[PDB]
Amino acid sequence: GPMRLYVGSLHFNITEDMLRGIFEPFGRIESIQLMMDSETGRSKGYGFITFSDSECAKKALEQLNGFELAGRPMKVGHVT
Amino acid sequence: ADFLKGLPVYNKSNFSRFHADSVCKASNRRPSVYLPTREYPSEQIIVTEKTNILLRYLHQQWDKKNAAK
Amino acid sequence: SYNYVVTAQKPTAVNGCVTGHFTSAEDLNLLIAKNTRLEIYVVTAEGLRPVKEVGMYGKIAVMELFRPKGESKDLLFILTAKYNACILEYKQSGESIDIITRAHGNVQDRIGRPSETGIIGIIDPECRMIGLRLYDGLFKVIPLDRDNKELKAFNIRLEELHVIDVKFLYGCQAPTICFVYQDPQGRHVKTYEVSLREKEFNKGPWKQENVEAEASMVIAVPEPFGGAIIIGQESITYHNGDKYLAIAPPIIKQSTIVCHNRVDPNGSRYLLGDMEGRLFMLLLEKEEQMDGTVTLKDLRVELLGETSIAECLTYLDNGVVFVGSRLGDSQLVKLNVDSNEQGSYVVAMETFTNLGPIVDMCVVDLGQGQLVTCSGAFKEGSLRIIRNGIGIHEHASIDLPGIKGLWPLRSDPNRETDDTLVLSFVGQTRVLMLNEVEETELMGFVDDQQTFFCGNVAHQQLIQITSASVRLVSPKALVSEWKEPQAKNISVASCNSSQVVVAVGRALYYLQIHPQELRQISHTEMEHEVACLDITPLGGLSPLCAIGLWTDISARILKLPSFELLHKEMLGGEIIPRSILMTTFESSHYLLCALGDGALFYFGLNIETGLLSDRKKVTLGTQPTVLRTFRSLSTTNVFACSDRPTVIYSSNHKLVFSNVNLKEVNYMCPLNSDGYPDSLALANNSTLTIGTIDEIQKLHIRTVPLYESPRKICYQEVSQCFGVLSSRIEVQTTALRPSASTQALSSSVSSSKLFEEVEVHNLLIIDQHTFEVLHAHQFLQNEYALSLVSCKLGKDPNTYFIVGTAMVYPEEAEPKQGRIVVFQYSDGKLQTVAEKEVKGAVYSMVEFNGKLLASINSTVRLYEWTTEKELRTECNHYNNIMALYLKTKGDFILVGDLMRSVLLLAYKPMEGNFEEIARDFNPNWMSAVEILDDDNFLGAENAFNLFVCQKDSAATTDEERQHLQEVGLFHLGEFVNVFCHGSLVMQTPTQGSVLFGTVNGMIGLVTSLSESWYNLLLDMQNRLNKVIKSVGKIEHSFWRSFHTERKTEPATGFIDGDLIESFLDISRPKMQEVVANLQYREATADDLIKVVEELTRIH
Amino acid sequence: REHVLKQLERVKISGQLSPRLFRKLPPRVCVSLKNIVDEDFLYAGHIFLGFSKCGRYVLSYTSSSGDDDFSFYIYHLYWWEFNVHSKLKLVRQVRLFQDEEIYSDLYLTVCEWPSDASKVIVFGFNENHRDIYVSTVAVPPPGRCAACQDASRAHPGDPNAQCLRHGFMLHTKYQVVYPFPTFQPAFQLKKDQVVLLNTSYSLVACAVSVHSACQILYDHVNYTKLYYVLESKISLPFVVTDLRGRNLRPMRQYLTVEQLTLDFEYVINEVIRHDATWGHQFCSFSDYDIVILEVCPETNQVLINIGLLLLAFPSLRPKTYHTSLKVAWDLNTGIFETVSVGDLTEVKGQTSGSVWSSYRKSCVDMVMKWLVPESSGRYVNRMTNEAKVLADSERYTWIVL
């Protein structure tokens, strides 16, 4: 089946496009969702990414998790 | 008073003959207005570097990298 | 559609001031920035000598003096708000003053975003570069280098995106900036080195430190201290690396410090100014070392006293400090060593009138219109009454009829001030002495003959010329006496310090004044009887005698002592010259001659030749004029005594006339006493007046201090008084000082039951003649009065003051409750008639065809006023964001929105509701609006531009009918707070008259033109721009371009009246060069003169 | 700690009025979409995108099928005039990507250029290819266009008959391959009238402009200017139409469509042969990913970063390495100059996927580092909405969805 991933600890300036940039080279992406602040318009610093195939999502998690992006270590995990 | 003694004097004669109007007016307030009819050419011209910072930087670094060998 | 904008009053707020040696290396200069104007002064013995004023084509944002290694005097660096950079030099050869543009260019960056705390311009102490903070994230460096044709600026990326203040440090091997920045973590101070070779930053001399959260200012301390001082809300800190010193003095905790300046060149002492107008000294305690050097031991702050609220401070010389105020009058103050009884060390020497900010204003006919403003803020709050004409501040009035002449006199030779006033009567003379009042007798002077002249002469002697004799007086005694051979009467008399010419009928006799001797030099007989005489020595022994005759009605210049005729002028008519005078104005010599019918002739006069040129004529009064020179504020001017008293003076090398606001003056003389410095003595048929004259200019201004902030003003003719909203700060409540609202005759307090430092609002009733606060009505706790109108409503015959308010709470952030209150001022007290609750802030109100139009938040509402004395809503309009401004004409309503431009409504009487006619679809952050006419709407916005909107008179469809088209655009350079229909002139090339009031205290006038006049004057502009050079080499067209961050657009449909008027001030050849090619056909340099003269009469 | 009314008192005495000082405070006016949309469009599938920068328009798009063509997509864009509380008037309706059978539901985005409110630009995306649709639609006339009136006079026309500037569209489609080039709207559109399009094999700078009785790109390589007029092999095939959709007539007022191209393979091969310190151990290159780092829109410089995968000798046997080339690209000249060349790092066991992700992270890092804020004047507007609030340029007016 597909696979949602939490992506958090993002610099507040990372865009939905940038996540697509960083994650997409791993596999097909069913949906990317960066949580925005409805009041300010800036991101909440976190979001979810859905890979069409889970074995891909797993590689992305492995490769990207705990690694600095914009100087902020990126967190990536499995979500029910 | 300690802190007010020795207040700077550039010319002792300054304000010596200062007498103000009885409604606190002393200085003349209507200077002749400068209206140039003729003008001296400017010796130099101020201009900005058109090159982007990041360009300039990345060019520099590389230029002093190949200058290593 | 076609508009014309001219200055009626130049900006008066001080934005910056700097001191240095700019004109010469020796002299000491004060330079003052008033928006677009740069004033240049030289410090002298008497105080400030004006040298030069220059009008920049830009708002001056940065103004720094600096001296590079190979320079004899300081250079001036200016940056304007539109990023015009220049380096300027004062040059002088002989008498000719020029400002040289050493360097110029525009430093704007497209990529850049203007910073929170605005434009900051700093120069390295070793003049190695100029640093600019223009935008968040970028530091612009202009390397200073003589041997280049291109001063190439570069940007250095700055990781700190929110910079509060930056300075260059002293005593550094590399140029080093020190700055305060804000981040989530707080406020901090950091240093960087600026390397020109790397076009990059380097790690600075010392590390970063967390500082005060309210830290707002950086001071670069000079050697031998080096390092920096950081000023916070309640803390002052010194840093120099290993050394860190911090003081938290309680004294500074009350208010915020907003400006500073260095007193001692080595930085041992600094002046600091706070928001409440307190003045402090910051002392740095030196520590001498075995090694030649000096370390900072301690920091002390000391309260010196109170000044105006200072925008900027500068120490001048001999304990004299110039206080430049934005919110109040500017000042010269003295710092003393001894305090006064109140414990104050500060003494005011001079005050300069600042109208700014004009927050509201109205035109009243107190046939000449007077303008009354709401001026200033906080303790500086005031009303200013502005009139055309000149006023006399009377200090004394004495019952003395039949005065036939008037002379000032120094009795003591060592006294350099007048102590005596000699008066003339039909056959008598009386002598008066100033403590104060009361008369005397002067030895050597006669009292039983009429004095025709008297006063101080050469060799420490005195003179008196009567109808009988000339008396020279020394120890006061008669030391010489001249009489006519046959003892005939002297009929006319004139005298300087050295010479005497007297007339005996047609006989003329020339005397000289020597030690204890009146020496007859020569004699002659004129063709006709002598009417009047003058021998003023022009730039103290005259080679010239000016004479007016009977019979031929002639003015003549005669050589002395030969009495040879150099020039005869037939004045014409059957009326004799009454008074004649030779005078200098602006190192230019004139003969002035006044006829007994009230006409005045003035000529240019050549000392060497004696030639009169340029008979110009003016009409002053019906009665004969008597001319007398006087000195006022270091300038020589002529008083013309008549039924219409006038001062004659010079502006831009041309003679100007201004009415003095008195009934009639027969005779006058200047009076420089100890009690009345540079005063004037005036005499009508019955009174001797002593008083001070207001500044010699077009505008005459009166100040009514309130000691709290005025907010709105309106006039109530029927009550013969003004209503003024004001607010005072009270502390947690109890007031800070007595002010207008706490000192009324009567007072009232709101009793409505409808609903850290605090504001307390009031409606002030102020007498229109005396400007006494007759009554003050205090609003509810937390109620802010926003709007005010005086008017009649409905069928009700009473006239009311109506106030719109808003409830403002600490734990809330926008208004949701408000009130409209109807007051009646009757029998000395303010009565509350009616009160209407509303669900927001009542931003604006206008009377509208006997109804009350109001704006509440984003709603515009129309109320009717019922029989039952209540406001009843008729209709609403809700399509606004924030309706702050309302203007009406007929059934039309112009709506100004803070963020959403202008909107035109109409009231439909049959439908009984509003209709949106059209709106301006450009976003514009409005400050003020006016209706110019039915189809033309004037707006001023937040970027200092004016624009004019029109209904589309070509609209075919209804959709097109609904756009307001922006047909006029113009960068004004001011922030408009109020627009007003009216004129300061008595009252054609122009239609309509809208005055405006600005934050900087500028008063302007907008008027309309025909397409024809516009096309002529626009062409004129373009020609004037090719002839007239702009200091800094800024293009006029660039300056006047409509400029916002979204768009930049050339000005259209607007003529710069100031430019146009300056055509009268250029040289004749350059005048002709402007008119080079033109049609009527060909060039009428004199016809264009006649045209512009018309345009100057609109104000 | 600030209150609206305290801020306004400040304004009158200081004369500093700026959107960024009230940015502390809550929206001035919120409106509900339910309350400003008409009844007819209420169940016709509109998805509202946002406000124009000028704040005069909300606009939206629709995605319907119909006919016998199920799972077959039509895209229309619509301009609505916002008038606060009153209902949104419909000003323009326009079909996107003409002549085009779309067998899949697109991710759609509309953009406005920084300083050009005359045209708007729309992007549509999405078995080892990816399809990209791009449309440039004229913006409705601000007020009353004299030329537009002539279009309803000199030509009888009717409602929706407009002149060229205020009524032309331009379509285009291209394919794209792994690694799928990033979407960089802020850079792609930083120069007015121009969009930079990454085809995987080249970068194409296209420009449209209207003129009346010169060149937006190549002034003073692959250039492709041609003209079109009103009335009935190249890098990037396109269709130029009017609002109704009639093909515009070529010329050889009027329209100018330009196309400057940068062939990645040329650039790579030449930077190695010329500038690379290791070009004499290079063999060949497998794959590349081009990311825009900056666009200097006045000087017309485009800085790009080229991530490479290649084969080279170590200094025995060849092996695959990763590097990045940095290249400037004049738009007036058409010439590119090397800015920087990186070292080779052995890719060993890392997949291609993780090599590209890792290359892109370093690009993001770099942009972020050198990022300077802009004025509200010059930002590229990007609108999107998939399946809460639509805010003005300044967030003082909200449409609550």
Ligand SMILES: Cc1ccc(NS(=O)(=O)c2cccc(C#N)c2)c2[nH]cc(C#N)c12
């Ligand atoms: C590397 C990178 C840079 C920029 C963008 N997007 S952008 O051009 O819209 C942008 C965003 C934020 C600031 C700016 C600026 N100045 C520009 C990218 N999108 C996906 C990316 C990947 N990998 C990527």
Ligand SMILES: [Zn+2]
């Ligand atoms: Zn058109």
